[PDB]
Design a protein around this ligand. Structure first.
Ligand code: SF4
Ligand code: F3S
Length: 106
């Protein structure tokens, strides 16, 4: 499974969904997750993310390990997203800000 980590929060560019062959992204208010059972590990999404927030599960940074289980959980409750849309309004003000998990909205 690939995993969306911290820098996606309050950015949510959604360029990542265009390239997904199996449509395994699920949408929240200010974040996207990858559904771990559905992802086929084709890796096509991770050089598409402007925020460089997508990682292979086995390559998630130490200090972002919480995001593996978070992706799995929220992929259960959030609606599937298959079409790109506009980035959130202030997305590049927030691109690169660390510790954005305190800002995650359900
Ligand atoms: S690695 Fe491939 S299958 Fe998994 S989320 Fe990214 S684009 Fe979709
Ligand atoms: S910011 Fe998030 S919505 Fe996709 S393009 Fe990057 S993982």
């Amino acid at each position: 499974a690939f995993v969306v980590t911290d820098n996606c929060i309050k950015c949510k560019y959604t360029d990542c969904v265009e390239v997904c062959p199996v449509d395994c992204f699920y949408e929240g208010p200010n974040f996207l997750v990858i559904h771990p059972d559905e992802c086929i590990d084709c890796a096509l999404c991770e050089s598409e993310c402007p925020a460089q927030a997508i990682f292979s599960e086995d390559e998630v940074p130490e200090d972002m390990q919480e995001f593996i289980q978070l992706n799995a959980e929220l992929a259960e409750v959030w609606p599937n997203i298959t079409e790109k849309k506009d980035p959130l309004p202030d997305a590049e003000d927030w691109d690169g800000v660390k510790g954005k998990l305190q800002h995650l909205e359900r």
